[PDB]
Amino acid sequence: DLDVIRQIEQELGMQLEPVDKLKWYSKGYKLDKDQRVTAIGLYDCGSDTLDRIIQPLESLKSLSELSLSSNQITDISPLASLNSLSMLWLDRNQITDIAPLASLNSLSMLWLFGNKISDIAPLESLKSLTELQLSSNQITDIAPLASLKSLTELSLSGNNISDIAPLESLKSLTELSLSSNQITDIAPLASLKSLTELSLSSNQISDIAPLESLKSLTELQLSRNQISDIAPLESLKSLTELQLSSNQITDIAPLASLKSLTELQLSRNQISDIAPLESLNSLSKLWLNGNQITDIAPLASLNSLTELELSSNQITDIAPLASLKSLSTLWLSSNQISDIAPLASLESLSELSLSSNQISDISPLASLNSLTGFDVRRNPIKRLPETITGFDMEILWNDFSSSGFITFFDNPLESPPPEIVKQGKEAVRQYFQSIEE
Amino acid sequence: QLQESGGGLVQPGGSLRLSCAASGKLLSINVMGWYRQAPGKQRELVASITTGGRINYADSVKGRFTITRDNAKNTVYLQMDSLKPEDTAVYYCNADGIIAGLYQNDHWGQGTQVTV
């Protein structure tokens, strides 16, 4: 009743507003045919909200959606008599016990991630659940979710979970978040086939045996692990994004079987040759920094690239990088490049990292007027070229790699004094014009 | 990830507008704001804003820096005016939210140098 809504309004002193389909950040209500309250949102209503609103809440028996997200509540005992709910938002609160969440026979969506929960037994009788958010908690075991069928989106990530076997009993899921945990065996994740997004981030996984069974995946996050063989991923070609960050891998030939992949982070590994990345013409982002690779020539056939991270690698010749034109970021610092001539055609560049190399002449990078980041620290540069002061940037002598900045550090600057070059771009220009005069 | 645009060398009393855009991967942003690192110091909050419209200021840049946010396109803007030379720092972006189903209250940007 609108009388109940007004009662809640003056009790909280907050202007609840007649609104539409409820969201986790909603602070109003939703009506019905004959003006019956069904959905109510209390976003950031204080820590004492639940114990003060339950009498008005139980007064109306038509409520089916409750948003108490980010209210920082500690006790949810009042959430027991409102047996007419369907969706419940309880994000980002100091909730430890979910025992009152037992009588809510009907619930289709439960959001609980930002909490301090440790025991998920009480939600064993919640039959018709379809969405569960339980990330960033202190849980260590998941037995009670086995009885929970009809789940499509599950987020159990950020806990101390080691066994995952009961997830086998759950076969309806679409997105599975299982990360920042202590997991070693993924054998249960075999009978799943409807899964599209899998986030198996930081864990002690080294044998991706059952993922071959999955076929509809489009996003695969597998980073900060101890994996070494990616041949299992060779069969699957449907992933728009597959991230393989810090690991110990030496071969990437199985990746060459993929063709629709878009963004590829391949960082901090022992990969030797990147030739298998010669047929992925649709790559928009490539992150290959911190590896032992020598030749960039096989990468001269990916003209759709837009971001390229090649830093801290053993590349000396940059010439077979002139073919690419639609490039915007180029990080290849901490390498052994010498001349930067075969980059003058990279008209679309907007950020560069050319530091910690053996580069003496900077003059070729002159036509690249689009650069909004250039970083040449720790290089043996002797003379500063005219075009170095023709860029829309300010100059810093700091050790930080900042965008919108021309940066030098630890450089034997002889003709331009280091004090002059650390004064600023205007000082560099006046010094050079005086030298001209 | 959070991408920051801005920064540079500004005369004292000048102004700046640091922009911070969160990628489409970051899903449910509650708190988003700005932090600083001075040389030989520690990280300290500058500004924080929430989806509901609550602003938290550092009590040292009160009435000086302004935080604005767009929730549709998840973007924060720090409009900074009358920059005293104690602000010569590297500014970082802080956010809370979800990437690929995982929630952390502290997602950081790369940082951008502001000098006076």
Residue numbers in the entry:
A (entry chain A): 3 to 439
B (entry chain C): 3 to 118
What do the authors of the reporting publication say about this deposited model?
To avoid these issues linked to inter-domain flexibility and increase the quality of the local reconstruction of each domain, we created focused maps from the CtRoco-NbRoco1-NbRoco2 data set by processing separately the N-terminal and the C-terminal centered classes, which produced map reconstructions with mean resolutions of 3.6 Å and 3.9 Å, respectively. In the density map, NbRoco2 can easily be identified and placed on the concave side of the LRR domain. The main interactions occur between the CDR2 loop and the first two repeats of the LRR domain, and, in particular, between the CDR3 loop and the central region of the LRR (repeats 5–10). From CDR1, only K27 seems to be involved in the binding by making interactions with E243 and Q245 in repeat 11 of the LRR domain. Apart from these contributions of the CDR loops, also framework residues of NbRoco2 are implicated in the interaction with CtRoco, with in particular its N-terminal and C-terminal β-strands interacting with the very C-terminal repeat of the LRR. When superposing the active and inactive conformations of CtRoco, one can immediately appreciate that the placement of NbRoco2 is incompatible with the LRR conformation in the inactive nucleotide-free state. In the latter state, the LRR folds back on the COR domains and interacts with the CORB through its repeats 9–11. Hence, this provides a mechanism for the conformational specificity of NbRoco2. The extended conformation of the CtRoco monomer is further stabilized by the binding of NbRoco2 in the curvature of the horseshoe-shaped LRR domain, which would sterically exclude the LRR conformation adopted in the compact CtRoco dimer.
